[model samples]
Target: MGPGFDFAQAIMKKNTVIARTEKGEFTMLGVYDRVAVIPTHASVGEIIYINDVETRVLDACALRDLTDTNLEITIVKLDRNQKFRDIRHFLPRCEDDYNDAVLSVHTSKFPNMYIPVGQVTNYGFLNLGGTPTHRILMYNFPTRAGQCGGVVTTTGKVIGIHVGGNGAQGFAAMLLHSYFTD
Candidate 1:
C-alpha cells in the first residue's frame, strides 16, 4: 500500500459502475457473484447498461416489510461477459458498527473519480412520498442526483446504501446481510 492508500476505497471504486437506463444513469455497486445492487427506484425487467455492458434488473427488495431498512437496494444480474472481480479482493460486511466515519462512493458526479467522505449524524425515519422509511442521516458530505444506490463503507466494511438527499444533508439505508442472502 502506498502513502494515504485505502484498500477499501480502492475496491469499492473498482466495483462501482454507472447503471444506465433509457431515461437516465444511476450508480450501481457490482458484486462478483452475478448479482449487483442499486436503488429500488429502478424498474424490474428493464434492460440497462452496467458500465458499458448490457444487463437487467433481476429482483428487488419489497417495501412490504416495515422492519426492513435496506429496501432501497435492487438486485441486478450481470451478463456472462461482465466482471466485478474486486468483490473477491475484499469482503464487505453489513453490520451496523460503522457509524463514526464512512465513505459514499458513486459515479453520479465524477463518474470514475471523487469519493465522498463524511460522518454519520444519527439514525432516524424519514417520510418519503407519505411512506416512513428507515434512514441513516449524515452531513459533511456532498450529495447529488444520480448518487442513490451507491455503497457506503467504513474500514472496508459495507454499512449502508445511499438513498437520497436535498443537498448537504443526505440519508441512506442501513446495510443488511439478508439483502444479499439467497
Candidate 2:
C-alpha cells in the first residue's frame, strides 16, 4: 500500500479472510476511531468466527512480524498528546496482566508458540513535513514484546505500518511501493 490510500473507500468492508486454521471466517471492518482523543487514532478491527462462532481478532499481527518476532505493537494519533501518554501507561499494564495469564495456558497448549507482554512508549505523532507530506515521529527501542503494523492514510490509502515506540524514535510501516519495488 502507498500514500493517497483511502481504506474506507478502497478496501471491501464485506471481504473475508480465512484464518490460518482454515476453520473460520473473518470480517474486515473499515478503519475507524475506536479510541477517541483530541487527535483520532485509526484502527482496523476484525471479527473472527470459527464454525459460526464469533470472536475478536485485533490486528496485532498486522503490527508485528508475529511469525518471526513476537513484538507488541501500538499506534496513536500524533496530534493527541494526552491520549498517547495515556496509551503509554495503559498498554504496558494491559500487556502484563494479559501475558501472565495467557502465556502459561497458551504455551502449554501450543508448546511452539510464545507471546510476551511488551513495554510501551509514546512515540510522537504525524504532522505536516512540508510539501503536503506527513512525517510520523517514532521511538526506537527493543523490549521483550512484539511490534505493530497497520494502515496509515493520507487520502484514505493504506500507507505505513504502526511499528513501535521508545523515547528517542519510533517505527512506521514503509510504503509498499518502496518496500516492494526496491
Candidate 3:
C-alpha cells in the first residue's frame, strides 16, 4: 500500500468520473443535452469530473417527485471540451423498451464486470416520476454490495443512473424527457 498504489484514483478514473465537492466526493456520469447527471445532492459550487477535466456546477434541479429516492441530477455547467464533444461516449442514448436481452452497468466497484443484468424496465415507465414525471426500471442486480450514483446502461446506450437497491432488486433513474432532452 505504498508506491504507485493510487488505488482510489484508479477506481475513480476507470468509470471516467470522480465528482468532488466541499461536502465530499462521488461519481459523475456525463452531460446530456448540455447537462451532466450528478447526484441530486451536489451543491452549486461542487466540482465534477469528465474527460479528465473538472468543472463547476452552475445550476441543478431535483426533479418533481424524485425528491425521495431518485438522486440523479441535471447540471448545466461543463466547460465544453473535445473530450466531451460526443454524448454517447460518456452517457448513453435514450432507449424505451423492456426485453430480456437488455443490459446495464453499475460501480459495484466499477460497473466493469458488467454482464447480463436483468432486462431494463420499459423505457416508457417510471418507478418515480420527476419534475415532469420520469421513467425508471427494476433490476435484480446480483450483488448486494456497491453504493449509489452508478451508471446503468443498455447494450447500445446507458439506460439510467442507479438510485436505490435492496438484497435483490436495484433501482435506476431512466433517461427521460426532462433530463434527456434537457
The most accurate candidate by lDDT is: 1
Q: How well does candidate 3 score on lDDT at residue 175? A: 54
Window of ten residues with lowest summed lDDT in model 2: 96-105
Candidate 2 C-alpha error for residue 72, in Å: 13
Q: Write the per-residue lDDT of candidate 1 for residues 1-182, one digit (tens) a residue.
A: 32112644665666777777664666677766667776666654556777657765554444424565534556667664656763533333433434444444555555444354556755666774355766455555767776677666655456666777756676676655555655
Candidate 1 local Cα displacement, residue 128, angstroms = 3.0
Give per-residue CA lDDT, model 2, range 1-182, as digits (tens). Answer: 22222222233222111121132121211223322111112232354332244435433322223243222223211121121111111111111111111011011123222222232233323332121112232323331122232222233233333433443444442332221210
RMSD, one per candidate, in order: 3.6, 17.5, 8.0
User: For each candidate, what TM-score against the reference?
Assistant: 0.74, 0.24, 0.58
Task: State, as a TM-score between 0 and 1, how close model 3 is to the true structure.
Answer: 0.58
Off by over 4 Å in 2: 1-9, 12-147, 167-170
Candidate 1 segments exceeding 4 Å error: 1-5, 58-70, 86-109, 135-137, 140-142
